[PDB]
Amino acid sequence: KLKKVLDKLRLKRKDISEAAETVNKVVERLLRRMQKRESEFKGVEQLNTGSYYEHVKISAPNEFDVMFKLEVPRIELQEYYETGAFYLVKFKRIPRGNPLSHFLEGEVLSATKMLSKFRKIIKEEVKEIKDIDVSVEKEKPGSPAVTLLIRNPEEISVDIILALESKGSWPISTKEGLPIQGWLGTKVRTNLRREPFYLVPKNAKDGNSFQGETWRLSFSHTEKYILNNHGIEKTCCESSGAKCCRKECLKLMKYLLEQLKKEFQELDAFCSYHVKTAIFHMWTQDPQDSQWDPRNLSSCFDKLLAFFLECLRTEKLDHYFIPKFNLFSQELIDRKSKEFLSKKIEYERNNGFPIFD
DNA sequence: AAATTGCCGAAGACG
DNA sequence: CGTCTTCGGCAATT
Ligand SMILES: Cc1nn(C2=[SH]c3ccccc3N2)c(O)c1[C@@H]1OC(=O)c2ccccc21
Ligand SMILES: [Zn+2]
């Protein structure tokens, strides 16, 4: 029954080839444009992130996430209040004379001027794309992405996300995050945390304004690794290993949410990352590969559902990397919303998920 | 050195 | 299920 639904969600290869071909051609053009003398954003390198590159994209290959990461040495972080996720950026010492001073505001490296330039360049370059139908969607407070809209003729969107790369140790609000010791283990956790961390120009919302110079932590790269390396056994989902249902559960919970979001705008606050964050916790709670045996798909999905209902009910979903940061705090998602989603989920759960049709 | 090449895992397609 | 395929990712090579 859930097998059937998964069959429908599964991406068709033909559809992937036509989408990738177009998406890739456009990104390499923008990446290439981004280099090339002049621009502040030279040494940017590409990192593909997102449901698609984690292989958990459903229904259609019509959403692509791309990080344009920039290595910036000698930066100091100041925690924006006690958010844990948001920061101000300064430099160790004076530039002499170097690219990113035209994004400063005194000593602070403002996310907003840096993003506005980045968007301006992307816009001038999309202007010149003649063989493909692509446009830049209008700006949005609360998003760090310059979003492309591609009609292939199918509608495809590409979020191009500027990122600052920092090679130093992770900020201490992450010190007790990534709790994978009993699952992926201590050597993996330590190795993961020796990788760089990234900041993206999503501004912290103070009230109903946005604090324009703040940046947000991003662990898209880390999350991408974990999806490709998700078992306690090294052979999970390999040719000489056992298939598990972890990813299948993530897709099912994704589908469920996205359907409810379609016909209910009481849910615009919710999103996929909530479901992703939740399943990460499930994977920590149930680290054994044997617990996610495909035979057990139904009970694994329902356990995920029960856990997600419990997060809603108790108004608490800890960020997986930054345990201070409550994604289900009253300030980000109002109580009323959380109860509405709870009743809809509970409804589908007890009625054999009619919305799956 | 910016662009090509080689290698192979993840997973779709098909019987 | 096995096998064959395309795509993504990576870094050695020119
Ligand atoms: C609510 C939400 N949070 N969210 C976060 S919170 C956060 C904290 C630290 C790092 C990433 C991050 N993403 C996120 O990606 C979302 C959804 O993804 C979005 O880009 C977005 C946009 C509007 C509503 C919800 C989301
Ligand atoms: Zn697995």
Residue numbers in the entry: 149 to 505
Which of the paper's sentences describe this entry?
cGAS has emerged to be an essential protein for the innate immune response to cytosolic DNA given its activation of Sting by the production of cGAMP. The generation of cGAMP by cGAS requires that the enzyme bind to dsDNA and use its two substrates, ATP and GTP, to generate the cyclic dinucleotide. Our previous structural studies have shown that upon dsDNA binding, cGAS is activated through conformational transitions resulting in the formation of a catalytically competent and accessible nucleotide-binding pocket for generation of cGAMP14. Here, we report the discovery and characterization of a class of compounds that binds to the catalytic pocket of cGAS and inhibits its dsDNA-stimulated activity.
Using an in vitro mass-spectrometry based high-throughput compound screen, we initially identified RU.365 and its benzothiazole analog RU.332 as inhibitors of the dsDNA-induced enzymatic activity of cGAS. The only difference between RU.365 and RU.332 is the substitution of the benzimidazole ring with a benzothiazole ring; the two bound inhibitors can be superimposed very well with each other. We can distinguish S from N of the benzothiazole ring by checking the Fo-Fc map during refinement. The sulfane group is facing the aromatic/hydrophobic surface of the binding pocket, while the remaining methanamine group is pointing into the solvent region. We tested analogs with targeted substitutions in groups that can function as H-bond donors or acceptors since we previously observed that replacing the 1-N benzimidazole’s nitrogen by sulfur (RU.332) did not change the potency of cGAS inhibition, whereas ring conversion from isobenzofuranone to isoindolinone (RU320465) abolished inhibitory activity. To our surprise, by superposing the structures of inhibitor complexes with the structure of cGAS in free state, we found that RU.365/RU.332/RU.521 could also fit the “smaller active site” of apo-cGAS in the dsDNA-free state without notable steric effects. RU.332 and RU.521 show similar superposition results to that of RU. The above comparison suggests that RU.365/RU.332/RU.521 could potentially inhibit every catalytic step (substrate binding, intermediate and product formation) of cGAS, or could displace substrates from the catalytic pocket. The cellular IC50 value for RU.365 (4.98 µM) was approximately twofold lower than RU.332 (13.60 µM). We found that RU.365 led to increased Il-6 messenger RNA (mRNA) expression in cells activated by Pam3CSK4, poly(I:C), or LPS; none of the compounds caused reporter activation on their own. RU.332 inhibited the activation of cells by most of the immunogenic ligands tested.
